[PDB]
Amino acid sequence: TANIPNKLTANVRTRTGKGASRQARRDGKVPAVLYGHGTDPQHLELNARDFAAVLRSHGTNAILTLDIEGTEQLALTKALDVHPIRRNIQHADLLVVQRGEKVTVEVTVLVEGDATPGTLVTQDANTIEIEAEALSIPEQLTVSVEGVEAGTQITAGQISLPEGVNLISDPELLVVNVVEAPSAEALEEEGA
Amino acid sequence: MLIPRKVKHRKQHHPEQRGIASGGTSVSFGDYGIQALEHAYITNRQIESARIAINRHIKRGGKVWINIFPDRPLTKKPAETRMGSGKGSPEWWVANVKPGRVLFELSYPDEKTARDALTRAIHKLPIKARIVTREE
Amino acid sequence: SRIGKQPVPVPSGVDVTINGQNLSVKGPKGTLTLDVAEPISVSRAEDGAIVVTRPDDERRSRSLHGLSRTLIANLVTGVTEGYTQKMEIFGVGYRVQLKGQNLEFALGYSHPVLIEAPEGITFAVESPTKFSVSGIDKQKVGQISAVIRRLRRPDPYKGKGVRYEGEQIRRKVGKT
Amino acid sequence: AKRGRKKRDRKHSKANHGKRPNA
Amino acid sequence: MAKADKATAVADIAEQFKASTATVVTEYRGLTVANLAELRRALGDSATYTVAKNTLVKRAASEAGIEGLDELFAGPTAIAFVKGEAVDAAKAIKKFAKDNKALVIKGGYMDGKALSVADVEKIADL
Amino acid sequence: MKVNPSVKPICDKCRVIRRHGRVMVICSDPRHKQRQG
RNA sequence: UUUCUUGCCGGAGGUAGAGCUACUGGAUGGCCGAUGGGCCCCACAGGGUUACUGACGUCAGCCAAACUCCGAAUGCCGGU
RNA sequence: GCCCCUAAGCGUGUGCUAAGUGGAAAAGGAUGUGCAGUCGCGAAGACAACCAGGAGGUUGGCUUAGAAGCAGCCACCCUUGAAAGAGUGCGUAAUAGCUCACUGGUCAAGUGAUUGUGCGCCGAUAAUGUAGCGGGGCUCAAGCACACCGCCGAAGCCGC
RNA sequence: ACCUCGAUGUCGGCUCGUCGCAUCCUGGGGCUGGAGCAGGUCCCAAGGGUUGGGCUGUUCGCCCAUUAAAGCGGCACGCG
Ligand SMILES: [Mg+2]
Ligand SMILES: [Mg+2]
Ligand SMILES: [Mg+2]
Ligand SMILES: [Mg+2]
Ligand SMILES: [Mg+2]
Ligand SMILES: [Mg+2]
Ligand SMILES: [Mg+2]
Ligand SMILES: [Mg+2]
Ligand SMILES: [Mg+2]
Ligand SMILES: [Mg+2]
Ligand SMILES: [Mg+2]
Ligand SMILES: [Mg+2]
Ligand SMILES: [Mg+2]
Ligand SMILES: [Mg+2]
Ligand SMILES: [Mg+2]
Ligand SMILES: [Mg+2]
Ligand SMILES: [Mg+2]
Ligand SMILES: [Mg+2]
Ligand SMILES: [Mg+2]
Ligand SMILES: [Mg+2]
Ligand SMILES: [Mg+2]
Ligand SMILES: [Mg+2]
Ligand SMILES: [Mg+2]
Ligand SMILES: [Mg+2]
Ligand SMILES: [Mg+2]
Ligand SMILES: [Mg+2]
Ligand SMILES: [Mg+2]
Ligand SMILES: [Mg+2]
Ligand SMILES: [Mg+2]
Ligand SMILES: [Mg+2]
Ligand SMILES: [Mg+2]
Ligand SMILES: [Mg+2]
Ligand SMILES: [Mg+2]
Ligand SMILES: [Mg+2]
Ligand SMILES: [Mg+2]
Ligand SMILES: [Mg+2]
Ligand SMILES: [Mg+2]
Ligand SMILES: [Mg+2]
Ligand SMILES: [Mg+2]
Ligand SMILES: [Zn+2]
Incomplete structure (x- = not known):
């Protein structure tokens, strides 16, 4: 499992404040902050279209290499802020990472397969925490369900993982649950 | 018909209806859900009507979640009465909702049927609404 | 547009006269007059065909091109054989x-x-x-x-x- | 009725800037 | 169908033609499923009966010298490959065509040259 | 000829058109004919 | 000039907001659930070998003028 | 505020409006129109249109008088393939037929969807006489949006 | 409770009008679970007409014989 960095251009902010941030967002640049173990916080700007394209292409957790006035830095998108209604990228958090580091990254999980007629699939947990080096973080994790019946509680620890990844979350977590199909009587009874 | 078992205080002011919802603005119980846009006081009977409308069309499979509960009361005084002489009595219960709040959540295999049921539900509410999914 | 692109063939036994925008056709079955839309111009190909051209590509021109072409074709066919x-x-x-x-x-x-x-x-x-x-x-x-x-x-x-x-x-x- | 709606919508003129006495 | 699928079909017919001795071209229009299945069963002993696309066979014909059959691909075309012997399948298709009256043979190929319908009839008789 | 604020293609054969600023739907079955107004 | 305005400095609050394993209440869906703090033989010993209850726990998503682990701009007193 | 009633621009440049919107309004409905961003397909022949094939166990099981693809429930299996879906319907008590879904042969490049936005349409309806631009009138804007140049305008300021 | 208490006189009935269409008949159409006579519903339309009696002061209402019909409302619940 290997991944390649994505290149983007960033500029040093001239002014800081709510007015400046609003003006930049209106213009079409999303403000962001770069901080890490280097003890040297920096706050920059990115191109909204390019950033959105990169996120769409390579998921939420992507390795980014930045061109800061001719200097190259390796950064990871730690967290994002999204407006609940307009659905924009209000702000971004970037963490400096060098090759050969252990990081805690949350990765989404997907469920695919076929179910028996009396089986209904439910997903209690959508994300898990895994520890791996920067360049081998998976973009998606899949779990297969085929011909299960009755109680088939899928445990988080039971998920198959690649090499070089540690399951930070305890094995006690439950991710996917399978229960008998509902009925009209139960549906009517519930909610009254 | 959802009502609270008991409340510490039985008569209260009008709930505040300003601002944008902060919590519960993301949908994670199933696959599809509803989010509001306007401000209004959703009633218990409206909630019941929406739930019945969804269920009667979904029929066998799936299940529905409700993320709100009409616990805050409202009062009405007897008609044909002058003003004053004290406050009225509680009549119907409402739930405060703000833009971004997620109301209902449904999980079902078929996207077409799910969206049809959600639209049937939306048509019964007093405010505009939009269908949203689990993925970002 | 798509329909009006094709020039309309003219049979040998058909007499065609053009006077500015007015158009008249003389044939064995009789003669008839016509008036064409101002925005669209019509030209007679020397090889025995009718050519209709549009100056622009907007709604009115696109709509009128096919109408004019089909109307001219109907007129020529009717004066030729009849109905x-x-x-x-x-x-x-x-x-x-x-x-x-x-x-x-x-x-x-x-x-x-x-x-x-x-x-x-x-x-x-x-x-x-x-x-x-x-x-x-x-x-x-x-x-x-x-x-x-x-x-x-x-x-x-x-x-x-x-x-x-x-x-x-x-x-x-x-x-x- | 018609009379009441007319006045309150007459406050949206350019000069009054949106505020008019007695609504 | 995808580009990979079309390429796979081209390669499939290319190798089928390479492994086959000769082939004939016929029209499958106006034939019911019952009689089509009957003909397939009759011809399955020695040869194989399938349907080929005009452009697809045109492209697959570039490898060999059968490019002269390009002019015969106008309209519907059903392709048959004679893996075993030559005359049995030709006579079978001729008898089926004359019995049905709804099938017309466009031509065939053998000896590295294309031949007209009269020559196809003569070689089938031989 | 039904007259309602909302007009929809009841069956898979209806076709929606516009005439003199009024949107009406026509179809082979007479029952399926209505207009806005 | 003790009045008022501006800059600077020293001052105590409990709103808006937000939060809940931080207290009192309302409350959505899951998990084991001993022990219903309890019921097929009542054995003094297998389980809802049976659809319950499931406490306490734990997974997550919420609400309150008479809730506050938190908490501002204005406002007010004093000094220059 | 600057077409006439009336003092001053039937001002300059770039775009939108076909509804007198401008000069009344909601849930909701819709092939009106301009801009920005998408995925699928398209020279290996895209979409529509104009000839052929659209089948055999098969009437799949329960249900019913009845159930054959089309009151209802379970799989929603499979052979032949180019394609057959336990089939979206308007068809008969039940069969039988018109068909259709994907696809072949002829023409030749646009064809669909949601995504966000500027303007618009329907929803529209009370009583003495148009009467919801102040009047005449205006889409050859005298309407709307973004920039630029001027003027008229009080007992306000300046001048004696 | 905003004008009228140094005054805005009142419920029905009679006489006399005028206006709106959310149409009772007359006039023109669409769809029908429209064979025809006869019916149900929607669309356009305000030129004309819309009776006489028994009962209560009535409004309202029941009833007796007719016609095409015996419409709903506004004008200080029209009009001393
Ligand atoms: Mg909250
Ligand atoms: Mg609503
Ligand atoms: Mg007010
Ligand atoms: Mg002093
Ligand atoms: Mg303090
Ligand atoms: Mg206190
Ligand atoms: Mg608050
Ligand atoms: Mg608590
Ligand atoms: Mg939460
Ligand atoms: Mg308050
Ligand atoms: Mg508080
Ligand atoms: Mg205070
Ligand atoms: Mg003048
Ligand atoms: Mg001008
Ligand atoms: Mg312009
Ligand atoms: Mg209009
Ligand atoms: Mg207007
Ligand atoms: Mg409107
Ligand atoms: Mg709508
Ligand atoms: Mg067919
Ligand atoms: Mg079968
Ligand atoms: Mg059935
Ligand atoms: Mg848009
Ligand atoms: Mg004017
Ligand atoms: Mg002065
Ligand atoms: Mg008073
Ligand atoms: Mg008085
Ligand atoms: Mg008096
Ligand atoms: Mg009186
Ligand atoms: Mg009318
Ligand atoms: Mg009539
Ligand atoms: Mg009717
Ligand atoms: Mg009338
Ligand atoms: Mg008259
Ligand atoms: Mg009146
Ligand atoms: Mg009087
Ligand atoms: Mg009176
Ligand atoms: Mg009167
Ligand atoms: Mg009156
Ligand atoms: Zn129809």
Whole structure:
């Protein structure tokens, strides 16, 4: 499992404040902050279209290499802020990472397969925490369900993982649950 | 018909209806859900009507979640009465909702049927609404 | 646009004269005049074809190009060969007959109904149950055909009335 | 009725800037 | 169908033609499923009966010298490969065509040259 | 000829058109005919 | 000039907001659930070998003028 | 505020409006129109249109008088393939037929969807006389949006 | 409770009008679970007409004989 960095251009902010941030967002640049173990916080700007394209292409957790006035830095998108209604990228958090580091990254999980007629699939947990080096973080994790019946509680620890990844979350977590199909009587009874 | 078992205080002011919802603005119980846009006081009977409308069309499979509960009361005084002489009595219960709040959540295999049921539900509410999914 | 792109062929036995925007065609069956839309210009290809061109690519020009092309094609075809339309009758005791330039019907009313023949159109009947209408102008032929058809109200039970050759009318049965 | 709606919508003129006495 | 699928079909017919001795071209229009299945069963003993696309066979014909059959691909075309012997399948298709009256043989290929319908009939008779 | 604020293609054969600023739907079945107003 | 305005400095609050394993209440869906703090033989010993209850726990998503682990701009007193 | 009533611009440049919107309004409905961003397909022949094939166990099981693809429930299996879906319907008590879904042969490049936005349409309806631009009138804007140049305008300020 | 208490006189009935259409008849159409007479529903339309009696002061309402019909409302619940 290997991944390649994505290149983007960033500029040093001239002014800081709510007015400046609003003006930049209106213009079409999303403000962001770069901080890490280097003890040297920096706050920059990115191109909204390019950033959105990169996120769409390579998921939420992507390795980014930045061109800061001719200097190259390796950064990871730690967290994002999204407006609940307009659905924009209000702000971004970037963490400096060098090759050969252990990081805690949350990765989404997907469920695919076929179910028996009396089986209904439910997903209690959508994300898990895994520890791996920067360049081998998976973009998606899949779990297969085929011909299960009755109680088939899928445990988080039971998920198959690649090499070089540690399951930070305890094995006690439950991710996917399978229960008998509902009925009209139960549906009517519930909610009254 | 959802009502609270008991409340510490039985008569209260009008709930505040300003601002944008902060919590519960993301949908994670199933696959599809509803989010509001306007401000209004959703009633218990409206909630019941929406739930019945969804269920009667979904029929066998799936299940529905409700993320709100009409616990805050409202009062009405007897008609044909002058003003004053004290406050009225509680009549119907409402739930405060703000833009971004997620109301209902449904999980079902078929996207077409799910969206049809959600639209049937939306048509019964007093405010505009939009269908949203689990993925970002 | 797509329909109007193809130039309209001109048969040898057709005489075409162009005077600015007015257009006239002389042929064996007669002559007719025409007026073209101002925004669109028409040109005569030297190889015996009609060329219609549009200056722009907006809504009005796009709409008018095909209309003008089809109208010119219809005009040339009509002046060349002509146009005809024939009908047929159904029911019991329904008859048609010809008297000079006029035509008389018998639809079962207390009185007989007459139809007046306008200019440039002639009626022809071969059988008491079937007749035909002939003319040169397609629009006029269609108008008179519609007027003839509208004489009797629709009947979805017994199908009594008049209609075109292969026209199929929806029918339903009243059990009572 | 018609009369009441007319006045309150007449406050949206350019000069009054949106505020008019007695609504 | 995808580009990979079309390429796979081209390669499939290319190798089928390479492994086959000769082939004939016929029209499958106006034939019912029952008689089509009957013909397939009759011809399955020695040869194979399938349907080929005009452009697809045109492209697959570039490898060999059968490019002269390009002019014969106008309209519907059903391709048959004679893996075993030559005359059995030709006579079978001729008898089926004359019995049905709804099938017309466009031509065939053998000896590295295309031949007209009269020559196809003569070789089938031989 | 139904007259309602909302007009929809009831069956898979209806076609929606526009005439003189009024949106009406026509179809082979007479029942399926209505207009806005 | 002790009045008022501006800059600077020292001052105590409990709103808006937000939060809940931080207290009192309302409350959405899951998990084992001993022990219903309890019921097929009542054995003094297998389970809802049976659709319950499931406490306490734990997974997550919420609400309150008479809830506050938190908490501002204006406002007010004093000094220059 | 600057077409006339009336003092001053039937001002300059770039775009939108076909509804007198401008000069009344909601849930909701819709092939009106301009801009920005998408995925699928398209020279290996896209979409529509105009000829052929659209089948065999098969009437799949329960249900019913009845159930054959089309009151209802379970799989929603499979052979032949180019394609057959336990089939979206308007068809008969039940069969039988018109068909259709994907696809073949002829023409030749646009064809669909949601995504966000500027303007618009329907929803529209009370009583003495148009009467919801102040009047005449205006889409050859005298309407709307973004920039630029001027003027008229009080007992406000300046001048004696 | 905003004008009228140094005054805005009142419920029905009689006489006399005028206006709106959310139409009772007369006039023109669409769809029908429209065979025809006769019916149900929607669309356009305000030129004309819309009776006489028994009962209560009535409004309202029941009833007796007719016609095409015996419409709903506004004008200080029209009009001393
Ligand atoms: Mg909260
Ligand atoms: Mg609503
Ligand atoms: Mg007010
Ligand atoms: Mg002092
Ligand atoms: Mg403090
Ligand atoms: Mg306190
Ligand atoms: Mg608050
Ligand atoms: Mg608590
Ligand atoms: Mg939460
Ligand atoms: Mg308060
Ligand atoms: Mg508080
Ligand atoms: Mg205070
Ligand atoms: Mg002047
Ligand atoms: Mg001008
Ligand atoms: Mg411009
Ligand atoms: Mg209008
Ligand atoms: Mg207006
Ligand atoms: Mg409106
Ligand atoms: Mg809508
Ligand atoms: Mg077919
Ligand atoms: Mg089968
Ligand atoms: Mg059934
Ligand atoms: Mg848009
Ligand atoms: Mg004016
Ligand atoms: Mg002064
Ligand atoms: Mg008073
Ligand atoms: Mg008084
Ligand atoms: Mg008095
Ligand atoms: Mg009086
Ligand atoms: Mg009317
Ligand atoms: Mg009438
Ligand atoms: Mg009716
Ligand atoms: Mg009338
Ligand atoms: Mg008159
Ligand atoms: Mg009146
Ligand atoms: Mg008086
Ligand atoms: Mg009076
Ligand atoms: Mg009066
Ligand atoms: Mg009155
Ligand atoms: Zn239809």
